[PDB]
């Protein structure tokens with residue numbers, strides 16, 4: 001019986017679901033402490049949905065007591081997301097084995113998530129640490145040892161004869177209507193076919209004169225669109241970045257917060273795409289960026305290499321195999 005404890009967010013829940021499924025198809029009782037918006041997703045994966053009140057969209061550790069209502073169903077191993085500190089604490093109260101999942105960058109002794117910002121121990125890595133990226137993409141991957149398992153992404157339309165482009169700012173920092181308007185004007189009369197995810201904050205009808213080569217929706221099946229996409233204007237979330245590599249889709253990254261800037265720079269230094277800072281996003285800079293990487297055959301070759309790295313990392317299957325072997 002394995003307990004999954006995670007914060008309420010797609011960027012943290014999505015790579016977990018494929019891991020839930022794999023564990024369920026090997027005969028483990030996967031319980032999962034989430035909220036309500038995520039309960040149907042964990043249960044489609046075959047997990048035990050344990051709805052709990054969060055009332056939050058710093059530490060806010062008023063959830064451990066809410067997830068303690070189940071001492072009768074005490075777990076044999078707790079799996080918690082790095083930001084989900086409740087699971088880390090809970091797992092130390094029962095002295096139960098515990099494993100850390102890294103939906104973003106892994107942190108060790110040489111690298112820590114922080115832009116020189118001091119703000120008042122548990123961040124030390126556990127015995128096993130599953131990171132949802134290949135080793136080659138982890139920052140300072142040479143300083144990481146065998147307690148970190150880089151399994152890569154954890155994953156579970158008619159097109160035409162023209163290049164297909166996907167535009168999405170993720171599921172959190174998507175409230176930026178000026179960007180969407182600039183994208184429409186940037187590729188209004190182009191040969192590109194655009195599929196743009198606008199978020200639940202904007203309404204497709206609101207936008208005026210929607211071009212015939214554009215398709216705007218509040219949400220979109222990213223994975224399905226990435227299998228036929230030729231380019232992906234993204235925001236630097238780890239999931240979207242790793243899903244683009246899995247699909248072999250080069251990137252234009254426009255980050256909205258610090259971590260996404262790390263990834264944006266990471267993508268740029270690996271030659272997997274272009275980092276276009278938010279403050280430089282214009283109609284012309286969007287056109288120049290898309291034109292720069294879409295005609296760069298060498299950059300595409302490096303994207304194909306990172307695709308192979310992503311495949312070989314193992315995915316949800318190798319992650320579940322590592323959890324079972326961890327006993």
Ligand SMILES: O=c1ccn([C@@H]2O[C@H](COP(=O)(O)OP(=O)(O)O)[C@@H](O)[C@H]2O)c(=O)[nH]1
Nearest residue numbers: 011014170171197219220222237238239240
């Ligand atoms: O229209 C959309 C927008 C996002 N996603 C998914 O939502 C996640 C985005 O998380 P990411 O870590 O990339 O950024 P965040 O949304 O947490 O900022 C990924 O799994 C995407 O595949 C999706 O399926 N459709």
